[PDB]
Design a protein around this ligand. Structure first.
Ligand code: SF4
Lengths: 55, 232, 247, 99
């Protein structure tokens, strides 16, 4: 609409095919080039031994 | 202010100065050739000019377009040489038209040349007095039965380069085979067509995933084996 | 919390009534070569627009498993991410007397996933007012000769039809393997107590083998249930490259 | 240099799977679809639960509930598009429902 973009920032998760990785030089908050993205079902438990499904 | 000695600046300001000779060197070692030393003139004894103990052979050669500027295009000099008797031709058909070679240019006052070049000797000889410049050969612009012309460029010349360079790809490796990033050092396994070979001269990676697997180097694969489906 | 590797791991909130949890596993690609890393830590991982850890140290978002990777040439693959799986179904009852055992003895396994569950958990009484049953099961590894208990799970719920869960272990020894699952609650002696258990299947996971040699990946693996149907916009408040600066 | 031609039509060794990875990011079938007819709330309700498979970039679910007619045919009762892994049906008349 009226947003001004520069050549040295990106806050968006851009497509990562044929797109060069990038280069970051100190500080800054950055977007990314998504290498993988997978929505699945998590498996119960974190670590150790004790696991409880429901309480 | 160029790092040039005090004797050269003493000679520059004199009203009546000696001749300023230019000595050229062509270095094709990095591309597969030798080093040739040229000077447009002989000395008073009709011999190739001896400078710092090195003999620069007589051969017609001269350059132009030499300047130091920052605003605009990078300066591209030009070196014109004689192609009588087919010398440069021989180098053009041999060393890929001399492309990629290094041209070194030295400016030297004749007063400081070695005592060999003069009949009476040179008490003022000082082999440290020279002004050096380096350039690369970009294109043999002309090559006829008479002469040859070369375009020179600064060794930096960021013309065709891009930044950043590494590219995201799937089903292809962007690393250099057996390079540091590739990290492979094993024996010969296969060629670029994934055909099993034990010959070290026919051992190149196909740059595909199977080529990487042939060498158990998949951890070092330069590609990204998930991005082909996220771009749909 | 490190340089060249990180673990993050703010904990997940314990559930109330069973249910599955959808997981969003992503891997980002940032920078090139060795980088300094996050400015602060888990406070510099903005999941949508908010940091995971509040500026006072509190956890804004529960279920975050950031595993940061620098761009160092010698790296390791991000742990926890799968690339292919092979599932074998053996859905059978698990009783106190008889365990199952299957002797997977596979070749290229990396992690093992067990798909257990309960056929029904109701506990009928006079008239109605059914109650939970609170069964307990045990998953054990071969571990040479000692049947070491990898996991012990307690399931507490009412339910009426089949409910299945899943549990993942790793650090698998060499593979003359013998996995097992056994029951702890005695049995359903009375018809009014339905607490039958089941072991539907198990999955062999090969995980990610590519240790991306010179990029800066992050990886999140956040439960996407808390967020809506909209996409999650991961942002990272990182630091940049490590330079070849004059001594 | 005519001898260039023979070198051009010698393309490299592509890996394989020219069918398109035999998936085409088509989501796998949803697993563990269980329907529970309960009435502890005073009236008949149906709670359907399932588990999301491994699907790329996001997921939603389409539910189609029909009822078998007297002649064996089906009557389209309801359709829904959701993002949660559970659904609840109420006010269902008697019949044999396929979800
Ligand atoms: S595919 Fe593997 S072996 Fe071949 S160049 Fe790339 S990293 Fe090296």
């Amino acid at each position: 609409n009226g947003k001004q973009n520069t050549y040295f920032s990106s806050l968006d998760n851009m497509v990562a095919q044929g797109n060069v990785l990038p280069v970051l030089y100190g500080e800054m908050r950055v977007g990314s080039r998504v290498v993988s993205q997978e929505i699945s079902t998590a498996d119960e438990g974190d670590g150790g031994q004790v696991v409880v499904i429901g309480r | 202010m160029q790092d040039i000695r005090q004797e050269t600046l003493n000679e520059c300001t004199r009203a009546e100065q000696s001749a300023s000779v230019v000595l050229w060197e062509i270095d094709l070692t990095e591309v597969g050739g030798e080093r040739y030393f040229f000077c447009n003139e002989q000395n008073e004894k009709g011999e190739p000019v001896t400078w710092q103990g090195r003999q620069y052979q007589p051969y017609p050669i001269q350059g132009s377009g030499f300047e130091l500027n920052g605003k605009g295009t990078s300066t591209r000099p030009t070196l014109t040489v004689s192609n009588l008797y087919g010398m440069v031709t021989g180098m053009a058909e041999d060393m890929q038209s001399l492309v990629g070679g290094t041209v070194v240019r030295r400016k030297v006052y004749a007063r400081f040349l070695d005592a060999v070049n003069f009949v009476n000797g040179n008490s003022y000889a000082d082999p440290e007095q020279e002004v050096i410049s380096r350039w690369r050969i970009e294109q043999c612009s002309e090559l006829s039965a008479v002469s040859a012309s070369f375009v020179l460029s600064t060794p930096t010349e960021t013309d065709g380069a891009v930044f950043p360079g590494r590219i995201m790809l799937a089903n292809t490796c962007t690393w250099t085979y057996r390079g540091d990033e590739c990290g492979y050092s094993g024996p010969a396994v296969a060629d670029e067509y994934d055909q099993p070979t034990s010959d070290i001269t026919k051992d190149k990676c196909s740059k595909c995933l199977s080529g990487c697997k042939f060498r158990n180097n998949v951890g070092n694969f330069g590609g990204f084996l998930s991005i082909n489906k996220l771009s749909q | 919390m490190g340089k060249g590797s990180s673990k993050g791991h703010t904990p997940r909130e314990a559930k109330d009534n069973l249910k599955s949890t959808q997981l969003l596993s992503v891997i980002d690609a940032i920078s090139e070569g060795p980088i300094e890393g996050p400015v602060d830590g888990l406070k510099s991982v903005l999941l949508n627009s908010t940091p995971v850890l509040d500026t006072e140290g509190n956890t804004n978002i529960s279920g975050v498993t950031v595993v940061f990777r620098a761009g160092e040439q010698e790296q390791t693959p991000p742990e926890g991410f799968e690339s292919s799986g092979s599932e074998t179904v053996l859905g059978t009852e698990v009783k106190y007397d008889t365990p199952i055992t299957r002797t997977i003895t596979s070749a290229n396994i990396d992690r093992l996933r067990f798909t257990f569950g309960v056929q029904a958990l109701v506990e009928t009484t006079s008239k109605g007012d059914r109650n939970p049953s609170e069964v307990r099961l045990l998953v054990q590894i071969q571990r040479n000769g000692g049947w070491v208990t990898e996991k012990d799970i307690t399931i507490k719920g009412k339910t009426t039809s089949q409910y299945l869960a899943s549990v993942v272990m790793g650090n698998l020894p060499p593979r003359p393997f013998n996995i097992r699952m056994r029951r702890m609650t005695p049995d359903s002696t009375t018809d009014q107590l339905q607490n039958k258990t089941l072991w539907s299947s198990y999955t062999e996971i090969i995980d990610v083998k590519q240790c991306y040699p010179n990029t800066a990946l992050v990886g999140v693996q956040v439960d996407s249930e808390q967020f809506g149907s909209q996409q999650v916009s991961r942002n990272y408040h990182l630091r940049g490259r490590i330079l070849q600066v004059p001594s | 240099v005519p001898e260039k031609e023979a070198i051009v039509d010698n393309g490299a060794h592509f890996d394989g799977e020219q069918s398109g990875t035999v998936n085409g990011v088509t989501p796998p079938a949803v697993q563990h679809l269980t329907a529970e007819v309960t009435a502890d709330s005073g009236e008949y309700q149906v709670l359907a639960r399932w588990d999301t498979p491994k699907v790329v970039k996001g997921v939603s679910f389409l539910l189609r509930l029909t009822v078998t007619a007297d002649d064996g045919s089906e009557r389209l009762v309801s359709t829904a598009r959701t993002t949660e892994t559970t659904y609840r049906f109420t006010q269902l008349a008697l019949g044999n429902y396929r979800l």
